């Protein structure tokens, strides 16, 4: 037991190194796509359905990112407590949570709570790839779009009952010592008008800014979901390292 926990601690240290490397590798593309999105938003009309809040919100998708392995000490517990807080806030605002899950631990938790999970993805929590994030973001965005024509409890012309909001509840890797579960509204996105300062030479948009913005917003959402998954993987590795250190101390 003691030897196993010590070995797991060292392996978790190596995994933390790998996860931090992955986050750093992902950073440049995120920065560049954010810059392009800012340019297109400055050039295009800010009226995308992903960018406009639905009136009378009545459903909110929530993606809870958890781990597959339970050797992490309180990582899943903190994530699920934050998810419960977000559910309470959504109910207070009058919205029904529509639950999506990443990882088996949250699946078991919500199965015990007997809360229906619309869709779940498992098996990649430790080393998530961009394809998993793209699939998750595509499902979430499709659900968000399906909610445009929904009223009350009727799916409308879609035939699919969507959601009016998208939130992500994952563990943010603040540092090696601190990893805090956070809730982030992935959609609808708000517009933060920063002071203009760049404007001396115009960008050329092919074919036109509106279609470029239309195509790039879903990609931005997928990129942010991928970043959240990477942060969750790093946080899970850190918390597993801490849990194994504590177990070795106990043993």
């Amino acid at each position: 037991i003691k030897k196993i926990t010590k070995a797991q601690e060292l392996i978790a240290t190596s995994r933390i190194a790998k996860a931090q490397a992955r986050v750093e590798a992902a950073r440049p593309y995120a920065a560049e796509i954010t810059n392009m999105l800012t340019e297109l938003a400055g050039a295009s009309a800010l009226d995308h359905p992903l960018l406009v809040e639905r009136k009378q919100p009545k459903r909110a998708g929530v993606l809870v990112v958890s781990s597959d392995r339970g050797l992490c000490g309180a990582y899943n517990a903190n994530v699920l407590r934050r998810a419960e807080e977000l559910f309470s806030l959504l109910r207070d605002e009058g919205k029904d949570p529509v639950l999506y899950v990443v990882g088996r631990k949250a699946l078991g938790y919500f199965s015990f709570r007997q809360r229906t999970v619309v869709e779940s993805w498992t098996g990649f929590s430790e080393r998530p790839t961009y394809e998993n994030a793209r699939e998750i973001a595509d499902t979430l965005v499709n659900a968000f779009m399906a909610g445009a024509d929904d009223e009350g409890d009727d799916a409308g012309a879609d035939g699919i009952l969507g959601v009016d909001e998208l939130h992500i509840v994952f563990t943010e890797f603040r540092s090696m010592l601190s990893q805090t579960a956070v809730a982030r509204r992935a959609a609808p996105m708000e517009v933060e008008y920063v002071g203009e300062v760049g404007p001396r030479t115009l960008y050329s948009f092919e074919p036109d800014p509106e279609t470029l913005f239309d195509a790039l917003l879903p990609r931005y959402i997928a990129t942010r979901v991928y970043a959240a998954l990477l942060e969750a993987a790093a946080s899970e590795s850190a918390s597993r390292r801490r849990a194994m250190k504590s177990a070795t101390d106990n043993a």
Binding site: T38, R81, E85, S88, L89, V182, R185, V191, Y193, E196
Partner: peptide
């Protein structure tokens, strides 16, 4: 379970920066 509601301030919202004057 009646869990405490998350503070709306604590919730962080994704935003799209625009280098334009405020409307």
């Amino acid at each position: 379970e009646n869990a405490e509601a998350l503070d709306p301030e604590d919730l962080e919202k994704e935003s799209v920066k625009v280098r334009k004057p405020a409307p």
